[PDB]
Structures are given as C-alpha cells and as structure tokens.
Symmetry: D2
Subunit: 274 residues, 4 copies
C-alpha cells in the first residue's frame, strides 16, 4: 500500500516503495533517510519558527527539500514507518555527550519500533553520529551500523546508547521507554531553539550521509568529507556565496521554495553573527 | 533537628519548628506554606529570569518575602520537607484545566511524599485551586482539604487530580510517578515564562491562602476575597499605586530587597502592557 | 506610467491607475489604502517574523491579502507613492497616546510627502485613529479628514499631531523631520514585536476602513462597526471558528496562501493565550 | 562641588575629585574611566536584563564593580560629566566596522561635550577601540589619543570616525548631532541584547584599559595583553574556573554582590553555549 505522503517520501528518498514492515525494510529506509534528508539547524539561526505538525514537516523536509533536527527528522520518519505499517512511537532522551555535571532535559527525540516480536530503536535526527540502522534493545551486544559500532545499555530503567570511538564507548544520550506527546516535542523544540545557551543557536550545523560509510559535515564554514569513518578532505569555505552553493551541491538543500526557502543574503546575516 | 535553611523557613511560615516527619507535620506545614508564601508570576511579566537552585529560591521566597509558581513554590517546599526528614521528590504533570484538545507539556511541578508507609502528594504551587493539604495516592476516595474536596482518578499508571464544582468532579491536571531532574524543571520554567502563548505572560497573578477556608486572589486589577470557598467582597483596584500597596498589604509581598524587589514604577510598566 | 508592483497595488486597492502625483491623487490613494489593506498585528501574536523589504511587503500585503502595522503598511504605501512619482521618505515618531511619563522610543513610522511645493504627512499605519487623508505640515490649522478632525501644534523642530476627541484637542503622537533608514524601521519593528511590554504582544488588533466615515474594529473577540465616527453595533464574537470567519468576511484577510496564510487552529492557539 | 554620586564615581575611578569642567578634566576622567570600569557584555549572555536608569547604572558599574557596554558605560559617564558641571548629551551612531552593505541601526551611544566654546565627543563605551580621550569635532585633523590615532571625517550631516589599522584607516562607527532620548537608548540596548544576529549574544567580551597605552582583551577564552598598542602575551585560558579568576584579577570584576554578582557555575553555563 501507498498513501499520498508515503509517496513523496519515497520520492525524496530516491528509493523504491515498500509495503511490508520488516526489519529489512527498516534497515534500508533508515539509511535512505540518512542520505536524502540532511540534518540542519538553519531555521534556528535565521530566526524562523519550527512547526512540528505532519504537514509542516511534509512541506519542509519533502517538498522544499530542506533539513531539520531531532524533532523534525524523526517526526517525518515516524510518519513514514507508520504509514508503511510498522509499530512506532517517539521517545525523548537526554544528550549526555559533553559529559554534563547533571542530567540535561529531554532534548532528543528518537523512535521505538516493534518489528518481528522484538524492539528496535531507529533514530535519524541525532546529527553527526546518528544511527544509520535500527538497533535491538539489548545491553552489551556491540551492534553494528553502516557508519559505526554502538552499544545500548540497560542501566536501571534508562537505556544508555553509546558508541565506539578511539578504543572505548562514549555515551551519546540516555532515555527510557516512557510515552511522549506532540507537545512534549514542541517543548523540546522550544528549548533547543530558544534557550540562550543551546548550542544550536551558536553555529550552523549540517550533516548528510553517503552510501559507503561516508558522510558530509558542515559547522559554519568548516566543511568535511568522510569515508569509511575517516576524514578525507577538509575544506574551509571562504565566503557566504560559496557556502550558499555548497549547501545546494553537497547537501542538496532546497534553497528555493515559496515558503521554506531562503535568500543567500539571509544566509549572510546568519553567518554574520559569528 | 534544624538546618540553617529550615530556620528562616519556619520563620517565614510564622510557625513553630517541627523535627518529626509525620502526616500531621505535613498537614500543617502545607497549610502554613499556603498562607505565608504567595503564588505570584511577577518575575515573568517584568522581564526577569527565574532561577530554581536552592539559594535563589531561598533568597526570593524567604528573605525577600516574594512569591512564585509551580517550580519555585514546590521547589522550596521540597527542600523544607527534605531537611525535616521526609522522603520527597518532585513530579511533573500536565495542566488539563482548560480541557485541551491534546495533552499539554509537563508544565506543573508537585511533590510526592512517603509518610508512614503510604504515598501522598503535596502541592503548594498550583495557584488558585492548589491543594492545601496532602492527599493519599488513591482513586475515587473523595479526599478533603481545608479549602476544597478532591478526587484522584487512576487511568492506567498515570493519575488525574480533580475537585468538586457544581456537583461534578473536575480534573485539574494529570501526572505519573516518573522521576524528574532539576533540568526538567528548568525546562518547565523556561516554557511557562517564555513560550509566547503561555498565559503567565499575559496577566498578573497572585493568590494567597487564609486560615479559615479563605483566600485572596488578584488577576491584574481584579482583587477578590473568599471565605469558606465563597466570593466575599470583590474590589477592582483603580490604579497602579493603589495596587502596589495592595501587594504588600494583602499578600505580604516583599516589595523591597536589594535583589528581588521592584519599584512601583516597574509595576506600572508591567500593567501598562495590558 | 505603471510598474509591475504599482500594478497589483491598484489591483488590491480596487482602484483605477494614477500616473500624475498630485494632492488629489494622494487624497484618494490614502483612503483607498485605508479601506483595502487592514491594520493587523497577527504575525506578532502567532510567533512569526516580520520582514520589511519591499517583496516581503509585496507578498504579504498584496498577494496574500494580509495586513500589517506602522512599518508594513506605510512601507508598502511609501513604495507605491514613489513608483507613482511622488516625493516621499518615511519618518519615525513617538506614540504618546497613553500620555506617558517620559517620551517613548520611535515606534511609529509615517510618511512625508512633497506635493505641489508643500509638505504633507500621509500615514496609513496608525491603526484605530490613523489619518485617512494627507495633512499639511502647519500648526493650529484644524485639518479635516474623512474620519476625523486633526490639528498640528509646535514645540521645537519636532512635530506633535492631535485630533479633537471628547469635546476638544489632545495629542496623538509626535515626530520630527529627521531622515530614517531601513534598519531604523527594522529596529522599530523589532521593538514593537518583541519588547515584552509592547501591547501588540498582548492582544489581537484589527482595523479596516470604510468609504463613508465608517470603520471596523477588532480587539480580540470584541468586534465593532462605526458610522460617521459612531459606534453602530458591537458584537462579541463567541468562538475561534466564528472569528476565523469574521477575519475573512469583514476585514478581507487572505487566510490562505502558501506563505503568509494561517490555519484556523493557529488562530486558536493565539487566542488561547488570553 | 561633589554630589552623592560623583562621590563613589571618583572612588571607583581611583581618582581625585574635580569640580571645574575643563578640557583637561575631561581628558583625565576619560582615561580614568577607561581603566577603571571595564567593557563587558556578560549580562547579555547569562540572560539578565540591562536597566539603564541612573541607579541601576550606579549599582552595577560602581557598587558592584561590574562592566557594561555602549549604553551603560557612556550613560554613567554622562551623569558624571553632568554632575561635574560639563555640558553633555548622548548621541547615537551606527557601527560600520564590518563595512556593512547597508547602514545598520543606531546601536552605539556616545557623548557630545561642550567645553570652552568647542565641541568634543567622548566615548568610553565602544570596547576594543574606544577613544581614551575627548576629540574635537573637526574633519581631517588627525587627532591623538593615549591608545591610538583617530581621524574623524565629514560627508553631509553625518560624521564618520576611524583609527590607524594596519596602516590605512578603518571606519568604525558614525553619527549625527541629533538629540536622543532615554527610550532611544533603551531600544538600542534592546536591539543589541536581543536581536538574534547581534554579535553580543554569541561570545563573551571584555576589555579594560591600562595607563601606558596598554589594554586587556578577553574574547571567550582568548585573553590578550597590549602595550603601546602591541600584542604582548596572548593566553588562552584553559577552563571556566581559571577564567572566573581572570575576570576578577585582570579586569577587576566584582564577581559578588547581592544583586549584580554571578556564581562561577553561571559563567560555566554561559561558556558552555559555545
């Protein structure tokens, strides 16, 4: 089967329809998503509100060929998986990367999927180190992904997904299986986009995934390409115009669109702040 | 026993020390609190950040003789009950009064107390209809309080709070027993104080409790006195100055204080917005 | 002559082209504008940034059939008068209606037009009591307008404008002939839309003008119609849906539009804040 | 003569009273100020409103031993010069350093002083390159200052200002002699502290002046000392604690104070955003 939405979803993912909800279907859609729809925080910098209702998400991520973060990406992904027939619901977790003194709020959205009597967690909105393939809800089991090795962890009642890096695991974010509501994400988005100390307000962030363990990475003007998890080439874009171009070339950002588009002069004012 | 804090706490509550954590101790401290420390949202209107660390709370609610809401009030209360020896932790719930189309975020804080092998919920920061006495965690049981009658539903794991009104139970807000973290309150406060559509940014709100089922109520210039739950006297303050006075008289607001005080001209700019 | 813009301008004003810049041309375009493009502050309440570059103005006020305030309205009007050949530039003035203790900032934009060796001030963005016809820059001279009587008094190189209200004269606002720059308006808009105590953030405001001294007035749910300056009929809209309708009927608001439109659920969240 | 204010002003300036308003008095007070009261934007980063009424200025800049920027510094300075008997009023100008495409708003405050039948412009609030000694209102005349050579200029009613950079002249800000009102500064401060793209919201900025053409410079963790206009020593502070210390040592920031003080943990949250 294929709903109106599900249609342009597959269309944007440069992928072929799927009607049967199976671990393999997930496996691919995930990577598809990860390569098609970039991780971007540009609506936060050029001041511009982020709606999270399936429609705004549809018109932003699909039609306008734009990106987003936690809430937007997994919000769209959640819809797709649902229309395809899977059993999903979002979850909120705490970003603990920076290794904070005290647990932070529920800033990160992620998906919980029930496929073939097991429970997996799909997440395409974590940015740089996001997963690129579902993982099973189990501790220790060093799971594998097209772009890395991760390890969940049943600590009491809050799982602690962590990944392999430089000979040992790093915590990325903790969460629990508690239900969440649309508003809980709206609040999550509100925090992230408006709390003065939120990093998302202090630098442009883009990240797109490629087929063979490769990925792109923009952080203001610092562009970087990776292959099989290695830093191959690192360009430092020299100007706004040049960057405006890089956004459309490398990440395939829909710079035009009656609604969600944005002039190049706007990208200039945004980078000007830094 | 009595800690430095616990000291000025009792001092502000115009109450006598208590060292033994029992339902009765709770019973009274609750009402004490409800009558001494007013519910106020003034720091939200005159723009002015709300810290929630025990110290800012101490200096705002105790020393400066000021009020606050959910987060501040129950934040202070939680500390006290803790220092007195009780077993407490905060909980976040969703305000459903307005009977919203879809569940709202975790805007409200409240306390869970374990006294004599049972579980009670104390809450002094809900404002107008806050409880004025602990309640037992049980369904149907129409519980009684110095200022009203409440009933807790048991919809799943989550609970709902209600109170009588025209011979029919009315739900105030829902909530479950999930753990919360300081940050979760900071986020709650952030939402409440800064989300554009938050009602707290559109009108002054004050509310203080009196011994015999009475309470005071300000909503901008509309002042109201209540006895045994009845509207006895309703004055419509005519001017800023007059109101400035009313805040100190009726609610016992510490209008002066190196830090948390505020001029009367400031209150004027605040009410000027409306 | 007629530029691409000037085209849809006249089209929105349900008016016939004009190519000769004369006091009479001004006289009508002013009233035209005043009846076609409503005074609205809706983008301020549903959080949504207000661009002021001729293009955003064009797309919002003309194509989407929406309204605006000081900055937007006169901004569009200024362009028109310019393309028609007049001699115009904006001015910033201080809103003194509330009769403030100390002069407020330059919140209000207005136009200065040099027609037939004289200087006139056109202003369609003041809302409720805006002018509806150019006025001559001269003191005492009680000038006449389709919707009221005005007057100009002196106190420096700065100008004060008034209108006879209840039985006599009283100040509306002041300003001076100093040059302004786009950014100065951007700042003016930033203030008005974001300074916490700005009244525009605390209630919906709409106002549209009618041919024979009549006008429409919305303030949240309070709708009011006026004839020859008199309150004929005052309805108190009972619900969001009904109001959503009233916005399109009475004011002719373009509720749809890829970009500047807004759902009715959005208007509900906005009125929910109050 | 010496007013209550003027008293602690001199006390903070580690300077001896002056009662006669002369170019020489200005000459020194300026340098005095420039070395005593640092240029700081810390209240912008840890969210915290900036009042500009003489009293808040007094309590922040003098009693709490804290710094500020444009509005606060020159605001305090203006009061002093006034109480001492000079003839002063503030002016607003536009920061053109970055060499913007179009004129920016009136972000910068500065002083205009009438001493011995001439007109000078004093400004202690511009930060890094602020003046350190009055200048005469005259074009071309390459004027000299304890920390640099500034050439003023013309171009219509406006005046530009520059300093020898590299060796070519780099326009700084610009302005006109138009009157300004308190609100005009409040709006200016509003812009600077809240407009999302304002650089002041993206990094900590501190700058203090020293006696012999030397000055200190903090930009986040990049500390720098200068002598006779040369970069002697550049330390890159390694941690928040260490920086907290550097603020009190090198710039003499009053880190404590019932009101304007700030914990070290607060500084951490601020730097954490970057």
């Amino acid at each position: 089967h294929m709903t109106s939405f599900l249609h342009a979803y597959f269309t944007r993912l440069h992928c072929q329809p799927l009607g049967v909800p199976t671990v393999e279907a997930l496996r691919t859609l995930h990577l598809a998503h990860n390569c098609a729809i970039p991780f971007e925080n540009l609506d936060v910098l050029l001041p511009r509100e982020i709606q999270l209702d399936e429609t705004a998400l549809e018109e932003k991520l699909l039609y306008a060929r734009r990106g987003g973060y936690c809430f937007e990406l997994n919000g769209l992904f959640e819809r797709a998986l649902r229309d395809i027939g899977f059993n999903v619901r979002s979850l909120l977790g705490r970003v603990i990367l920076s290794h904070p003194a005290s647990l932070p709020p529920r800033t990160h959205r992620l998906l919980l999927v029930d496929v073939e009597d097991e429970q997996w967690i799909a997440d395409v909105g974590f940015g740089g180190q996001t997963l690129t393939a579902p993982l099973r809800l189990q501790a220790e089991i060093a799971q594998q992904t097209p772009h890395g090795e991760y390890r969940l962890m049943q600590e009491g009642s809050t799982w602690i997904l962590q990944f392999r890096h430089h000979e040992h695991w790093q915590s990325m974010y903790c969460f629990d299986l508690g239900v969440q509501q649309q508003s809980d994400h709206v609040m999550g988005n509100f925090w992230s986009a408006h709390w003065p100390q939120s990093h998302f307000r202090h630098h442009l962030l883009m990240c797109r995934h490629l087929p063979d363990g490769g990925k792109l990475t923009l952080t203001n003007f610092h562009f970087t390409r990776y292959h099989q998890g290695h830093a191959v080439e690192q360009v430092n874009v020299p100007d706004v115009p040049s960057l405006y171009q890089l956004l459309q070339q490398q990440f395939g950002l829909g710079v035009n669109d009656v609604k969600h588009g944005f002039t190049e002069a706007e990208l200039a004012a945004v980078m000007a702040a830094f």
